[model samples]
Target: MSDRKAVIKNADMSEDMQQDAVDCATQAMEKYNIEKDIAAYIKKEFDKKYNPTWHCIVGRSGNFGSYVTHETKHFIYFYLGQVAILLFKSG
Candidate 1:
């Protein structure tokens, strides 16, 4: 498996917003009609503890941007198999 990492500058997401992010991700997965197994794997990858200031990234390969709060304080980074993407909140 390839290894990669990314760093976000600032992000600020609320609890509801975080859940929204999850919902968005879920919708994306469904829209793409990804395999159940693949979806499960991605969910597992995001199964870690939730942090209001942190956003979750999902993707089998290549890093994608993350969601952040409107306030702009915390951030989230994503690392795919070979690519890395960052998401930061900007005021």
Candidate 2:
């Protein structure tokens, strides 16, 4: 936020057509599609709520950049696949 503030402030100090502060916020959002800043919460749920194989698959699937939206859908299907395997001894 502070970095973006400086970007807009520099233009505001210049001649006509000052930059908009809201534009700065919009630009930041466009540049960084960051996930929630709750690393501990995500890790805690990932660590305790699944089996070892799912752990390997899910842990490796985490996004290093923006959150991969489809990964959540993938995880849901993968976990349900586990339930199918456990119940029928075959998927």
Candidate 3:
């Protein structure tokens, strides 16, 4: 209930923006229990705050695998507990 900082996996964004994305994911994770809901909320906020084409994926570490292209300096993968968040922008 006290700490919720993200444990980063891989990231290409700036420090400030990286923190913002983590904080945003933390908040969404707290507010919603479902992964889809968390991803949706994070994506919506990122798209609104930064620009369009932002994407978010949330799930456990071993639950899935991903390999894709994203805009340079606009991708982040981090974990909050067992759940991981993938935030990126493409096209």
Each model's TM-score, in the order given?
0.32, 0.18, 0.74
| TM-score for candidate 2, residues paired by index | 0.18
Sort by lDDT, best first. Answer: 3, 1, 2
lDDT winner between 2 and 3, please give it. Answer: 3
Question: Candidate 3 lDDT, tens digit per residue, 1-91?
Answer: 7575458888887776578787887788788778898888888888888878677878677654545463334677888777777888774
Provide the lDDT at 84 for model 2: 11
Q: Model 2, range 1-91, lDDT digits (tens) per residue?
A: 2322212212212221122222322342355333231222332333344332221112222442254233432322112111110000011
lDDT of each: 0.40, 0.24, 0.75
State the displacement of the C-alpha of residue 74, model 2, in Å, after optimal TM-score superposition: 8.3
Candidate 1: regions farther than 4 A off:
1-12, 33-71, 76-88
- Give each prediction's root-mean-square deviation over alpha carbons: 9.6, 19.6, 3.5
User: Best candidate per TM-score, number?
Assistant: 3
Best by lDDT: 3
Better of 1 and 3 by lDDT: 3
- lDDT for model 3, on a 0 to 1 scale? 0.75
